[PDB]
Ligand binder design. Structure first.
Ligand SMILES: Nc1ncnc2c1ncn2[C@@H]1O[C@H](COP(=O)(O)OP(=O)(O)OP(=O)(O)O)[C@@H](O)[C@H]1O
Ligand SMILES: Nc1ncnc2c1ncn2[C@@H]1O[C@H](COP(=O)(O)OP(=O)(O)OP(=O)(O)O)[C@@H](O)[C@H]1O
Ligand SMILES: [Mg+2]
Ligand SMILES: [Mg+2]
Ligand SMILES: [Zn+2]
Ligand SMILES: [Zn+2]
Lengths: 439, 439
């Protein structure tokens, strides 16, 4: 049912006019309008594309044929074309039907006159079937895909795929709508306000919210409880944003002290730098595949990114290296740092090539066809990148030398306790002990 | 039939005169002429090729066998050639007939030394059947392909496919004729002038104008209207040129302020810049996947582009980031500007590599085989491009320095009054008040 697709109102509409166009044509086809020959659905993974298609097949009332985009090419030459001829043959052999081909990437790759062969023999047959010499009517076709630009230009033409519909990640309102829908059919308690969960999950799809509610319910029943409450939703939310924790893996005191100084370094570097994102939990329990992680959670779920925020992030990604390099001396820096060091490099490149934030290079886009530029401009670009990185390192140590006391105090805070909230990090920096258990 | 194909009157003339040959040969077989042995049809997607094939099949008054390039080549070896032999056996058997192999991209592939010994058997049979040893007369063949150069050289050889006919995207008058044709099924109002819309859609094929009319009609019938009128055509044309409207979005006032300053920058750089394309409406309502777009629009749809107009395009691309720099200081530049830069760089390269508009590079075409020139001239070229872009952005920055008052005036005129129009933009840039409510 179309009510099961909460959020993405435009896409649900733009299939819903097709459905109610089928149910009573004369309310729409009076002035000469007629059925659209095809809807395309594009967007990231896990947003509601296949869901919307299953809802259209549920509320339409006409015969609905579905196939993946990979059930065509078995191992000979000309087997896919035969299966499209028989697919549309069965399709037009009855009333106005709908034909949902899912994963349209697998037969939608654009044909390029360099090696075109038996490979593109299925696509040409689909093209001749959608809009060919013999004009049939009544057949609608719906196809989904993660990759709109890989598709041919002869598929995305009007007359074959009349309208294009993009289903992407929801915002806070639609997000709270999705949670309100999945908080049904679970024995909630009071205390549960889905707007609160929606404010704290920037950048989650529908599949991840629904998974949140599900494993929160299972965790509720496994504690022998009676109703689901904000502690459970908070737990599962942490299991999605950070990773499953592990209260095992016995390890020495020198190691856990070292990690305490590493994550202490990221935290202090991220809490006193103008432009950094707001802070979140900062543990040393090995959760996920990492040995402790300082997570940051935005609130206004931005789409763009300024320059000060890029430099602030670029400084957060080195507080561990500079931290343990200021405590344990220089010849004792380990090799774990390199991992997060990796990510810093990526940011710096986007600041120079794509986004255009270096005055020495210019306001030019060296990003795509990086291999077409000469060697001088790439020398200047890469030199600019490295200058950004080491400048950020210098800022980081200049700051961690004047915040030494908060560094040690917070290190002991992470070594006595295992985790810390945000304001718990603040008070542990100030020095007032927290109301909880020293593990 | 041939009156249904509005625009591309040359191809229409060729096929009209072929069918006119099949009507009364004596007007043409006096001086000894004989029919063309073949007509090929090339052009981009959606420009009316299969349509002309339908017209000639409908009016030729003789048999008309049609197939696709993919209805050959099933599992076993030598079945495609077999089907071609039987196709021309039926063709010879029936009458003076016509044969339409739609989508010749499949079987008309280029021959090369590295084909796997069985790919080009169908093609070779098609060649020994068209102008082989046992010559005959009475069979005409028509073919359609998007990729004329991707065809073998023995299919295009006169004797086989005498006439190479070139369907192409219409000009202004052609679009007027297409719209006037397709509006004959729409219950129209009296405020409809297709010349306006034809002047509004510079670059659309015939199919896109078709479903433009269709969606305008269907939208007219959603609003409980009585006749499709000009505002509806405006709605649908805007939908196709920019995308859906996406009414339901939560927008912090700082966000939509910053956006209004970005498109304010583009609009001013396109307003007072010599040679820039005349300005159409500039909105900040979140259309499609962009958060606001200023949309320029030409007048006389020329194909050439002078050097003045090119530099105008570069400046129009730099105006946005220059706006954010002038208002929010330099550190507060976002990453949305990347989508601007990526376009401008493109134009810059066309000014230097292929259009021949530089002084140090020369009057030479460095475009084709870019990877084959030396490393010195590519250094010179890329230095030239970088200089073009830098000079562009500095011109933009002092232009927006002189027009600061109008910049704030139009930014505030966009935070209020969503989606101004060009005339309305000029009224806002002086201080008038618009004859319409605020949102
Ligand atoms: N708007 C929504 N309302 C309710 N549930 C949603 C919504 N959007 C997504 N979901 C959840 O997402 C799941 C289906 O995801 P979907 O199949 O749409 O992803 P997808 O677009 O197919 O991704 P991929 O193309 O990578 O498979 C459902 O189980 C559903 O619970
Ligand atoms: N010149 C025209 N006059 C009227 N209608 C047109 C014209 N050109 C295209 N159309 C519309 O386009 C449709 C068919 O387009 P056509 O099949 O010619 O594209 P095509 O040449 O096959 O492109 P492709 O080969 O990429 O599919 C028709 O249904 C018709 O409504
Ligand atoms: Mg799916
Ligand atoms: Mg065609
Ligand atoms: Zn780290
Ligand atoms: Zn822009």
């Amino acid at each position: 049912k179309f009510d099961d697709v909460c959020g993405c109102d435009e896409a649900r509409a733009e299939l819903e006019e097709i459905v109610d166009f089928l149910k009573d044509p004369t309310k729409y086809e009076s002035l000469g309008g007629k059925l659209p020959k095809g809807v395309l659905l594009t967007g990231p993974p896990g947003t509601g594309k296949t869901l919307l298609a299953r809802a259209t097949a549920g509320e339409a009332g006409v015969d609905f044929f579905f196939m993946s985009g990979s059930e065509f090419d078995e191992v000979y030459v000309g087997v896919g074309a035969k299966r499209i001829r028989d697919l549309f043959a069965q399709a037009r052999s009855r009333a106005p039907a709908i034909i949902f081909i899912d994963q349209l990437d697998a037969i939608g790759g654009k044909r390029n006159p360099k090696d075109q062969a038996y490979a593109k023999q299925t696509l040409n047959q689909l093209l001749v079937e959608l809009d060919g010499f013999s004009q049939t009517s009544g057949i609608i076709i719906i196809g989904a895909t993660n990759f709109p630009e890989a598709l041919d230009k002869a598929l995305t033409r009007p007359g074959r795929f009349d309208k294009v519909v993009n289903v992407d990640l929801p915002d806070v309102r639609g997000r709270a709508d999705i949670l309100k829908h999945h908080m049904k059919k679970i024995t909630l308690a009071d205390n549960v306000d889905p707007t609160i969960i929606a404010r704290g999950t920037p950048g989650l799809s529908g599949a991840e919210l629904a998974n949140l509610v599900n494993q929160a319910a299972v965790y509720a029943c496994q504690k022998n409880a009676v109703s689901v409450d904000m502690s459970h939703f908070e737990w599962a939310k942490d299991k999605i944003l950070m990773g499953a924790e592990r209260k095992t893996m016995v390890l020495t005191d020198a190691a856990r002290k070292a990690t305490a100084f590493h994550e202490a370094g990221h935290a202090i570097m991220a809490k006193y730098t103008n432009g950094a994102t707001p802070l979140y939990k900062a543990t040393i329990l090995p959760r996920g595949r990492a040995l402790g992680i300082t997570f940051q959670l935005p609130e206004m779920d931005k789409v763009d990114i300024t320059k000060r925020e890029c430099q602030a992030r670029l400084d957060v990604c080195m507080g561990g290296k500079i931290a343990e390099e200021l405590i344990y001396g220089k010849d004792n820096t380990t090799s774990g740092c390199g991992s997060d060091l990796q990510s810093a490099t990526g940011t710096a490149r986007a600041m120079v090539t794509q986004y255009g934030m270096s005055d020495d290079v210019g306001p030019v886009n060296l990003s795509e066809e990086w291999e077409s530029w000469s060697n001088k401009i790439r020398d200047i670009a890469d030199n600019e990148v490295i200058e950004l990185l080491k400048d950020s390192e210098e800022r980081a140590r200049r700051l961690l030398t004047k915040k030494n006391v908060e560094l040690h105090r917070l290190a002991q805070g992470l070594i006595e306790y295992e985790t810390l909230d945000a304001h718990e990090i603040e008070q542990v920096c100030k020095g007032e002990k927290l109301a909880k258990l020293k593990t």
